[PDB]
Symmetry: C2
Subunit: 264 residues, 2 copies
């Protein structure tokens, strides 16, 4: 917003001669006029290019800010930060969708809204969009809808939406870290429905990805499900010892507590 005349002040290396009001552009009081903007460096795209790069810097700051709190599980502080930013009257169909997605789910987590009310308020952002920035944003929403059928028992419809993501996965496999989040959530519910068949296939497909993308993010939880999926049907001890290893090195003691009560 202020970056317009910021690099312009330094690109000068003549402020009096550029043909009075010109000196307000280097501060950032008012946005430059249609005809006045053309007068600079006389390229036309670069004066606008910086405005997007300054925007996407602070947008990604916020997008990476909600991540830290999500892991911290500080939902009320997400809810507040996502409301105060939303409170500021700003127009962006792609950024608003994310903000309001995080708002509805946070409210659902904080038990402010119903499981169904949340589904409805999420569905509307999904079925009515014009996203040209991040195509994966709408995919995370579907997982957000699908994974909130688990502690609800509508998993039969949940799996349908998880299988619906597999079809969209083949269309430019750019982000694999998300596959691991979906495949793990898919395999989490398959074991809950007590379908021990393709629950193993989904785990061993995410384990395959985690080893090639070098992300041990869900790996501990992934081998724990392999050891539990193999538990009902030498290979069981193999996956059991593999998981237990990660839990301590990744500093996850909470999930390490319910390990000894499962082995012996």
């Amino acid at each position: 917003a202020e970056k317009l005349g910021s690099e312009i002040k330094k690109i000068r290396v003549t402020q009096k001669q550029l043909s009075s009001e010109v000196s307000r552009i280097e501060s950032g009081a008012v946005y430059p006029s249609m005809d006045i903007l053309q007068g600079i460096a006389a390229p036309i795209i670069h004066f606008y290019e910086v405005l997007i790069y300054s925007d996407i810097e602070r947008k990604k700051q916020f997008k990476d800010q909600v991540i830290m709190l999500c892991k911290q599980k500080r939902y009320k502080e997400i809810y507040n930060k996502v409301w105060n930013e939303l409170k500021k009257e700003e127009y962006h169909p792609e950024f608003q969708q994310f903000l309001q997605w995080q708002y509805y789910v946070a409210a659902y987590v904080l038990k402010k809204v119903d499981y169904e009310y949340c589904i409805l308020e999420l569905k509307k952002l999904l079925n009515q969009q014009l996203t040209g920035i991040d195509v994966y944003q709408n995919l995370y929403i579907e997982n957000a809808i699908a994974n909130i059928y688990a502690e609800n028992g509508y998993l039969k419809k949940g799996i349908d939406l998880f299988e619906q993501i597999l079809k969209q996965l083949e269309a430019l496999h750019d982000n694999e870290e998300f596959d691991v989040k979906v495949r793990y959530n898919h395999a989490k519910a398959l074991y809950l429905d007590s379908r021990y068949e393709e629950s193993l296939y989904q785990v061993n497909k995410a384990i395959e990805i985690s080893c090639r993308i070098n992300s041990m993010a869900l790996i501990g939880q992934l081998y724990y499900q392999r050891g539990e999926c193999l538990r009902k049907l030498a290979e069981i001890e193999d996956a059991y010892k593999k998981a237990s290893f990660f839990f301590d090195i990744l500093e996850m003691h909470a999930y390490k507590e319910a390990l000894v009560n499962k082995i012996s």
Copy 2:
């Protein structure tokens, strides 16, 4: 480049809203004029916003294309792809710098240029810039210069440039995956200079990050250096067994071959 009148054709959902040549904007034969651009949706930033998002889509495609080949170690195919793209007369100080960085290093790898000639051709990109997209791009070049002092023996000056990156790491810790690449390369040379003291500190500092960022990218190679740094028997066996585990699961047999010749 063609995305200008692409969403415009669909945003119409009006056809004869002039106030003839207007129809070629849908194809993208010529870029729209300054005064003609104003007569659209009647916002002004959105017609330009798509042009950057279409640009950064295909730019990132290429940036993520060089990555796959780098791991594949298919340097001549990088060298060719980076030359053919460079051959196309395009003006971008940030994209050109990357292209030519990959070109000089590839030539150095293919043994086309000297270690010093490479240093010089890399140094010029570093000392003359105006970055406003990837701030970490010039840091990768520094590491590229610094890590190419190893099979050269000027590691004393190499470490100076590696320590120079530590100061720049505190200034907004965005990419932790790069820290792991630098800290590992720093600790690789410290062991080569035969300074077994802070070679252990640097490994365990990156091991700490790899566990918090959930990236097992250099973890196998990191524990292998911990086991070798501790080598010059209880703590040594601990780091030795830890590394060996990863090598097979990450499908790295080449580095697994020189394990049995080190344990017994």
